[PDB]
Design a protein around this ligand. Structure first.
Ligand SMILES: CC(=O)Nc1cc(Cl)ccc1N
Ligand SMILES: CC(=O)Nc1cc(Cl)ccc1N
Ligand SMILES: CC(=O)Nc1cc(Cl)ccc1N
Lengths: 300, 237
């Protein structure tokens, strides 16, 4: 069980870690989150009380270092930092734990809510999408644009998701125009899986990271990427059976976790109706189709 | 963007453009089978690809053999159209290639865009106009070459005959669209109007009769009467 301590909480803020969200008052005696499960990536996110504009946060893995949060009054945000002096961090953390100044990441008895959302998500792949090599953790916020968004403007602050474009030479073999556009299996299996991602686990990891960025930060380009990666599979007639079964599980838990009041904008009607009811895989996503029809029958 | 009445004179500026109409590519007769079921039999079709400034018509004849053993023919027809338009463009010298291709039906946009990925600087556009190019097979000489074809064939025509010697391309296109709208509305009457007087001849190298300027005004007036009269009865207007 690991710990993300805080130097203090000078401004009133809603903090979230994964699916949990809690409020900290201005200058409240708050010094962090303990009992964070080892083995998973995590995200610690912020929304200030005064300016609900800009949700922001940090993806991290406690196995990669000792991370703490401190409010910067110049830049006006809570910053993640790394403390390399392990003995000092241990002392700072023991101090806070003895004074009971930390909230407790709960352990729930039948709970796989976070694992199922982050199964294929790896810190090393996050760090290639979010390029800031001097830190072991990755900052994301509501406004960051994707590489593909910038092709249609600060490169350092971009989300370098794999570009997917159904009307592109990469997607369409000369001489197979109709074939490749109506059945995207070539583009899925040879261009993307074998060529770019190398395996379906890395594909699913980027799909899961995109969803989580879209959901926790309202990153429009993350939402675009998540739906593009779903649509590329559903629009492929030839998909390995294990991938379809895992996609169904992935999407089920994403749809399950989605706040009901954000579905209106977080779900793209066209993609989901095409995916569930018109595509090659219309009959391959039983769990996802069942939860969608019972939770969001309006979209369909 | 989309082409409509507001940007109508753009058709006659000096950027090369082509209209593409696919409505006569896949053509069938529907008939009964010996068992009392229904079947289709394909007949030859054509892509109507037209430069509205010059009158140059690239009539790609679509022979029924292209459908043999194929499924989902109405979908295939759109892709075949886009394949043939892309081949046409590639066959033209760079300085003759269009800057825009305007499709008469929106279902042609994605097939043409995908086939033209190599030409990112050719704009593929729809239109809000309800152009009557489907009636092109009511022009006797075009129908004849389509139905006689025994293999794939491209035939080149000027759909304006020699009109551009005496009128502008705006006026020529307006006359063409009036004639075609008339033929689409009431083919028999329209054709009677055109070919009732025997002294007026269609030259061997032309599609339409050799009307004097005065006769074209009468003709054009007669086509309008046919068309608004028939708009006339369609609605009780
Ligand atoms: C207080 C301060 O400046 N640094 C610090 C504080 C916490 Cl919570 C953890 C590690 C460090 N370095
Ligand atoms: C139910 C529960 O304990 N929620 C929660 C989780 C964290 Cl991490 C911090 C504060 C709260 N309230
Ligand atoms: C402005 C805004 O809410 N954009 C947006 C963001 C996400 Cl994540 C998904 C869909 C939309 N429309």
């Amino acid at each position: 069980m690991n710990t993300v301590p805080f130097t203090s909480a000078p401004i009133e803020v809603t903090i979230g870690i994964d699916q949990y969200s809690f409020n900290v008052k201005e200058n409240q005696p708050f010094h962090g989150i303990k009992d964070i499960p080892i083995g998973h990536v995590h995200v610690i996110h912020f929304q200030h009380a005064d300016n609900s504009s800009m949700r922001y946060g940090y993806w991290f893995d406690c196995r990669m270092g000792n991370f703490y949060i401190q409010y910067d009054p110049k830049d006006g945000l809570y910053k993640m930092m790394e403390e390399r002096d392990g003995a000092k961090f241990e002392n700072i953390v023991h101090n806070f734990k003895e004074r009971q100044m930390m909230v407790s990441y709960p352990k729930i008895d039948e709970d796989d809510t976070w694992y199922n959302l982050t199964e294929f998500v790896q810190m090393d792949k996050i760090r290639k999408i979010v390029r800031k090599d001097e830190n072991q953790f990755s900052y994301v916020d509501s406004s960051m644009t994707t590489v593909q968004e910038n092709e249609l403007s600060d490169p350092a602050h971009s989300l370098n998701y794999t570009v997917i474009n159904f009307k592109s030479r990469e997607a369409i073999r000369p001489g197979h125009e109709m074939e490749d556009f109506l059945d995207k299996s070539y583009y899925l299996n040879t261009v993307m899986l074998q060529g770019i991602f190398k395996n379906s686990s890395n594909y699913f990891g980027e799909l899961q990271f995109a969803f989580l960025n879209a959901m926790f930060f309202g990153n429009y380009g993350s939402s675009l990427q998540w739906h593009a990666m779903i649509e590329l599979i559903c629009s492929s007639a030839t998909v390995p059976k294990h991938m379809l079964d895992k996609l169904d599980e992935i999407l089920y838990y994403q749809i399950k976790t989605l706040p009901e009041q954000y579905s209106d904008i977080l779900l793209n009607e066209r993609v989901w109706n095409i995916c569930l009811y018109s595509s090659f895989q219309k009959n391959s996503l039983h769990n996802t189709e069942k939860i969608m029809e019972n939770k969001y029958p309006e979209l369909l | 963007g989309a082409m409509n009445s507001s940007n109508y004179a753009e058709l006659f500026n000096n950027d090369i453009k082509l209209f593409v109409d696919d409505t006569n590519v896949y053509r069938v007769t529907v008939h009964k089978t010996f068992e009392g079921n229904v079947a289709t039999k394909a007949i030859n079709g054509c892509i109507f690809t037209l430069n509205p400034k010059t009158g140059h018509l690239f009539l790609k004849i679509i022979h029924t053999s292209v459908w043999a053993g194929q499924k989902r023919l109405s979908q295939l027809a759109k892709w075949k159209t886009a394949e043939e338009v892309s081949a046409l463009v590639r066959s033209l010298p760079k300085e003759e290639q269009p800057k825009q291709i305007i499709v008469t039906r929106k279902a042609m946009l994605d097939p043409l865009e995908v086939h033209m990925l190599d030409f990112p600087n050719i704009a593929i556009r729809p239109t809000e106009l309800r152009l009557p190019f489907s009636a092109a097979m009511s022009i006797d000489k075009l129908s004849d070459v389509v139905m006689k074809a025994t293999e794939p064939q491209m035939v080149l025509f000027n759909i304006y005959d020699d009109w551009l010697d005496r009128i502008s391309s705006y006026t020529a296109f307006s006359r063409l669209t009036l004639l075609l709208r008339a033929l689409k509305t009431n083919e028999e009457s329209a054709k009677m109007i055109l070919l009732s007087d025997p002294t007026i001849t269609i030259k061997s190298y032309h599609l339409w009769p050799s009307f004097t300027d005065e006769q074209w005004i009468t003709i054009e007036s007669q086509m309008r009467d046919l068309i608004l009269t028939e708009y006339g009865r369609k609605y009780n207007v």
